[model samples]
Target: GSRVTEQDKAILQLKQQRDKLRQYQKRIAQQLERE
Candidate 1:
């Protein structure tokens, strides 16, 4: 059986966090433009 491991979990977590940061940066850039 192919078992999921902690390393894979951390990788997914990091990817999700990266996506969140990516969206956040876009919003921040718009704010900077307004200022």
Candidate 2:
């Protein structure tokens, strides 16, 4: 099947986590500016 393997899953998860953290940080910075 043309599906992702366990290693691919792990890498995707890490990328998602990194993206989420970046988004969170951006939101925090925006909030600080609004204050």
Candidate 3:
């Protein structure tokens, strides 16, 4: 088999960043409701 590809690495990074942002955004939503 071959080694890991650059395209997959970029995709993984995009998904990771999106996951982090999604969590951050969701917390703000609940925090606003409490306020």
Candidate 4:
């Protein structure tokens, strides 16, 4: 049925979003510290 494959895809998308957000937060922290 490929149900497992679908779940894997969903998890990957979530992880990608989390990673992008994490990087953005880190950049903001650095900018704040620089100021």
Give the lDDT of residue 6 in candidate 1: 89
Worst 10 residues of 4 by lDDT: 1-10
By summed lDDT, the worst window of 10 consecutive residues in model 3 runs over 1-10
Q: Which portions of model 2 show Cα errors greater than 4 Å?
A: none
* Candidate 3 lDDT for residue 2: 66
Candidates 1 and 4 compared by lDDT, better number: 1
| Top-TM-score candidate index | 4
Clashes of each: 0, 0, 0, 0
Tens digits of per-residue lDDT for model 2 on 1-35?
A: 86879999999999999999999999999999998
Report the CA-based lDDT of candidate 1 relative to the real structure: 0.96
Clash pairs (backbone) in predicted model 1: none
Clashes in candidate 1: how many?
A: 0
Those runs of model 3 whose alpha carbons end farther than 4 Å from true positions after fitting are 2-4
Give lDDT per model, in order: 0.96, 0.96, 0.96, 0.94
lDDT of 3 by residue, 1-35 (tens): 86889998999999999999999999999999997
